[PDB]
């Protein structure tokens, strides 16, 4: 399952005639595109590898 979430503030005069506004005209734009399932877990680092990436000398 994939989730696309959007939030922001829109000026009414930036909305086009077809009730559309580009995402670059939204003030506090919060855009999120995430997923779950084993596909999403396959894109997470292992805990040991994350620990090393954060605490290894090099």
């Amino acid at each position: 399952t994939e989730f696309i979430r959007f939030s922001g503030v829109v000026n009414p005069r930036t909305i086009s005639g077809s009730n559309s506004v580009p995402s670059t005209q939204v003030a506090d734009a919060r855009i999120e595109y995430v997923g779950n399932g084993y596909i999403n877990e396959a894109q997470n680092m292992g805990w040991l590898q994350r620990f090393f990436l954060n605490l290894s000398p090099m």
Binding site: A27, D28, A29, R30, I31, Y33, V34, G35, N40, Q43
Partner: peptide, 10 residues
């Protein structure tokens, strides 16, 4: 002042 936050995957 302005801020844009984008989260894509990881």
């Amino acid at each position: 002042v302005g801020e844009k936050q984008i989260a894509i995957n990881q």
